[PDB]
Amino acid sequence: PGADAKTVQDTVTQVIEQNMNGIDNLMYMSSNSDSTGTVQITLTFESGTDADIAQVQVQNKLQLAMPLLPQEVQQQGVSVEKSSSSFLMVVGVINT
Amino acid sequence: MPNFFIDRPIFAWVIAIIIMLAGGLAILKLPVAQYPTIAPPAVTISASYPGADAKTVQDTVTQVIEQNMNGIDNLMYMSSNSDSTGTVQITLTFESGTDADIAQVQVQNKLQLAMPLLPQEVQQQGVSVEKSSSSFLMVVGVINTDGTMTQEDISDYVAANMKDAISRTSGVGDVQLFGSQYAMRIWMNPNELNKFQLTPVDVITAIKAQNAQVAAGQLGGTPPVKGQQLNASIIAQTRLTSTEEFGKILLKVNQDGSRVLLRDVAKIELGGENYDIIAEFNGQPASGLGIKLATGANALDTAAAIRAELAKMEPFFPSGLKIVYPYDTTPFVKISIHEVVKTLVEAIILVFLVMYLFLQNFRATLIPTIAVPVVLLGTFAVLAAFGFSINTLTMFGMVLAIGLLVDDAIVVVENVERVMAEEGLPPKEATRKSMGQIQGALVGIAMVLSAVFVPMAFFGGSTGAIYRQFSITIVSAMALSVLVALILTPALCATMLKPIAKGDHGEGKKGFFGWFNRMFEKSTHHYTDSVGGILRSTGRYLVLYLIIVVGMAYLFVRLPSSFLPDEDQGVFMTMVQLPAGATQERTQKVLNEVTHYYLTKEKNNVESVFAWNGFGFAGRGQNTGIAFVSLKDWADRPGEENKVEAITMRATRAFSQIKDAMVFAFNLPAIVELGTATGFDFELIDQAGLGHEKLTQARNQLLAEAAKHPDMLTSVRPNGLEDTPQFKIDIDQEKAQALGVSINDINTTLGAAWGGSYVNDFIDRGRVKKVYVMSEAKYRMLPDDIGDWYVRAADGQMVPFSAFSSSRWEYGSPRLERYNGLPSMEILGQAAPGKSTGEAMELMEQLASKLPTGVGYDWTGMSYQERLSGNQAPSLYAISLIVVFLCLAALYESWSIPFSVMLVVPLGVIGALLAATFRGLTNDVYFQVGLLTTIGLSAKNAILIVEFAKDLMDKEGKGLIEATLDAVRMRLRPILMTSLAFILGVMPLVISTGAGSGAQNAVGTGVMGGMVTATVLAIFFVPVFFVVVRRRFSRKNEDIEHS
Amino acid sequence: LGTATGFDFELIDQAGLGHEKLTQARNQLLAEAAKHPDMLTSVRPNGLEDTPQFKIDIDQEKAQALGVSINDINTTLGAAWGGSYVNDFIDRGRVKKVYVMSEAKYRMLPDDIGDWYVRAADGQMVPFSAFSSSRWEYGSPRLE
Amino acid sequence: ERLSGNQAPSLYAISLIVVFLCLAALYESWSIPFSVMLVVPLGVIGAL
Amino acid sequence: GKKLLEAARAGRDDEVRILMANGADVNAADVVGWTPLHLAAYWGHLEIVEVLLKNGADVNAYDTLGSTPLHLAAHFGHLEIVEVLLKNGADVNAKDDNGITPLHLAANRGHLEIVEVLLKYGADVNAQDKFGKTAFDISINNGNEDLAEIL
């Protein structure tokens, strides 16, 4: 919260990225760090990779880098999600 | 099936082609590696505590993690060491067959929950969890031949530019850096600190405050005021990026307004994260990468990709940076591939030669030339379906299967040539009759050979994993071979063979061939004459058979066993160990002498020496070192004297003169991931809180006892390190409190200055790296230096360490070991000459039972496998025997006739034992699988003799003696042609020297010897077996003919 | 899957060149591509251009002379302008977060920076303007 | 694309070969398969 | 020179005898100034102590921090070796670089018998270490009422 792109990138993004090795069937990894104080690091695996195993291997490597992140970031929650799945629906909620 | 395809020879060709197509594709696509997974899966947790002693590591880190290692499936044992470099490694080893991903995940999950209980200094270094049993694919070295870089400069370049492009390379999976990326080093000066009334606490505080990356929000940030027009990030402090910026960190503003900067109390440079390991390549500074193969990956693809990738990189290297390849298993593997294809190709040629010698037409020689490659190619497709790789073991499984495949081709072709000559039938109709004589037996043989080779696959542990490689390869090729013999080779016989006039045996031919036919026709009559006279007095030869059976047993118990032969892999290792307390500089001089020796006294054989100062195989430390020697290619090392085994024995002799260290050179095991093979691996265990000193006493007691049985135990020694002097410093709490000096400032000053401290991160050329503070070397060398460090009291006075501390020498451990969570000491050893490791083990346990109360023991490693895998061999062979009997009973429709095949088993075994014994080889795994294939072939030879004889009595009413003699008359020729081709085709393996010849010699020698005695003995003994078995178990008129 | 159409290219700083030199290389490539409209169409960056940002430098010497700790300075600036997650509370039985931040009208413009005061060791309140300075520069709102 | 362009020719080469072989077995003939296999362009031209 | 030290550390008797019988310096000191007698006293090899003393081993050799074989033996409770060293001229009041005497060390571990032997041999009960502390102070701080009496 409150962080600029470079601050995100150099206290969070690089730290996590330096621990993304030892992961099977990895095709490539890309990331962005922005002025809203948000980072997303996306690891893309070969077609046919078991997505549960890939998520678990990524999480395990993330887990070991968590003590090196700022406490402000740890306290927001660092999530690891399967991101290639399709949207089933978008629900809106309004108050008329 | 054979009749269907005799009438459809193109359909049969299409099936064979599709098989070859499937295999060729499998060959293009399968993983290739030196060995498949043989070692039980292991997972290693590694952590580091900068500045920590062994006991501190063990009691704040190792025990904490170990107490949380439960609830983990398929765990065989756990071992750990904690050492004086502040490093711990905890290794958890799982049952063979455990899914290594699941084991790593379960270990990580349990570790994860213990992480909040570890010191923050350890958490901040990263606690890694790695699969540690995988094999090394290569070792890359990086040097700078311009001489412009320290090992720290080179390691930083590798870390920042090389190591990740390598990890992304196709098939790599796991990479160890030799060294670290740069750290910003702040080397503190206690004289300058004291002058300004500062301590390392103040230095650390200032660095954390002035090398900081601050989140500061935005102008016009959300939620905003209405009408806001500007939105911009606020950029406040950012991490420092250079030594100059760290130097101007403001520590203090003096009374007179003057400024104390960090560069006024410290030297500031880019350096390494730690300095415990000096690495040299031929005496030059080096870094590098240890590169492991990912599970089930292709090694030849990965290696070639790594090397092209590093070539993609070379243009952008700083001047002088050079990539070297001291270890790469790719060359040895290609040697292995080439030797096996060579063996296969020359086997095909020799079958052509024997086919034309005996059958004298090129048409018949073509059919085995077609069938065998079809089966070989096709076996690859079967391997693919089962998920095996192309490796040393699967490839030798194929060469060990050549005898069986050649035999299916010879048996089908030769029998059709015989039926044509003896009956004048045309090829098509002779092939239909001939397949009718043999196809039921071929199917029985397939079931029998399954029963021989499949039980192997159910051995446990590592040796089970090795045998399974041979068992599935050989069974698959044999099964495919019988398919091909029922589909393709009949079709080829019918369409390709030319008719033979009835009664024509080529004795009316001219030249060598006519002489040969008359020679062989005459020889066959002498053979049947000799058999007929043997059958007149069978009791005498039964006695001879018992003699053979007894001698076989005798030879069997006298032959030493082993695992896999050592190979010249083009590299070997030399270990260096100096006395307690010895320093890095002293180790370096010994390593420099080792390097110099290899590069002068062995200038012709040695290409490089990769010397590591600071770790060894007994443990880590300034008094330990390793020199990894890479040789010139085998081709430029001709002769026995230029092979690894001879080089290493010279070096060890030459290094006996070096008196300031223990220096030993040795070869790698064949399967380096396994180490070991030889000897036993014992764990002594403190099971009653006795403590480290009492454990060592027990250990020394056991070691001395063992030395009093050199008849049975040899070289019983601890695996690790002896206690050494350490400097015990006691802080006086009362004096510290009287002076107003806080214990926190004391322990931080001492630890940061003498041990060093990771403070926070900085950005070096765009890359995040660590910042460390530590004393400059010259203020942290000797006990006298302790009193030069001052701590600031609450009232502002500076107090020297000497005012509130005292010190003395004592002994402690630089490397504490634990086994299944209890203190332990590992003891290595072996059986004395001509003794069993099994009995040596028994003696160890008996000695160990005398040790003091509360000291227990266990076996680990190679010895754990044995202690849990000895009841298998008899019961699995009992299963094999039973199923073979049953398959034979079904084939023959008889409970007794099976015995006349089964008795052939010793005949081949005695020759194998003789050839191994005469040649000084061992009962190892290549010998054992050779045995099964020799036994397989001899049994198949017997099945067909007995099948012909029984069918003569059943379908033609011939009497026992006449059917027996006619049967062995027909079988003599195909038996001899297979044996001649096979014995010749294994000959290059028996005499091979050089790369891979340990395995080649071990597969060739017992097979050649056993083929000889199986051939020579079986052709006389199985007619005897059949006659005596039929006579003992019968009822009514079998000696006379009938209708 | 998105995409289908076209190509997806990554330009990469492989020598520690830094963000500004990377953008220059990118702009070079983009202009070259524009000179081959016969073959390449609509070659464009996927992300965001550099933007003005407000660089504020804390003077360490003045802070130390006034007795103002850097921790209090950076926390005051970050909590007020960036906001800070403090701890949790219970809202109708459900645990939720507590945040502190400046009300919007005191954190909009550079002039507002000097309205924030930090307490020195001797108890005096010191405005941010006494120990800091600021200027405009360019930086990235989205680093890839 | 940059890792999947060599596939199309070699996988269709495989298809052609196996089709020929199945036809050879069906007809017991190495030549008659050609008289089926030549039909391939006839439908393809209309699709195009 | 070095074979004696590790022989005495290991506790290998006939070796040690062969090494003076072959001329090994009984006063050979390792890098921290420990002599075979230091090592033998430390680990508790009483018979070795007798043999080196019988062979002229300096009973009052001190290491680089001033500590003597008697310190080691008093500290770790090797009563018989304390007696032997004392009968062979061991300085009962030797101070290491911290001011610490064998009486302090024996008191700190609660070895009542060694304390009485040292006293019988003239240990200065009022000797102070660098912090002003006597063996009595140590016994009070430890709560050892038995020792606090004798002192």
Ligand SMILES: CN(C)c1ccc(O)c2c1C[C@H]1C[C@H]3[C@H](N(C)C)C(O)=C(C(N)=O)C(=O)[C@@]3(O)C(O)=C1C2=O
């Ligand atoms: C046991 N092992 C993997 C080896 C083998 C050969 C080597 O030459 C080395 C290691 C450990 C590595 C780990 C690295 C580590 N890291 C990747 C930055 C690390 O900082 C340490 C450590 N274990 O604390 C080293 O000693 C280390 O700097 C080092 O010098 C090593 C090294 O040179």
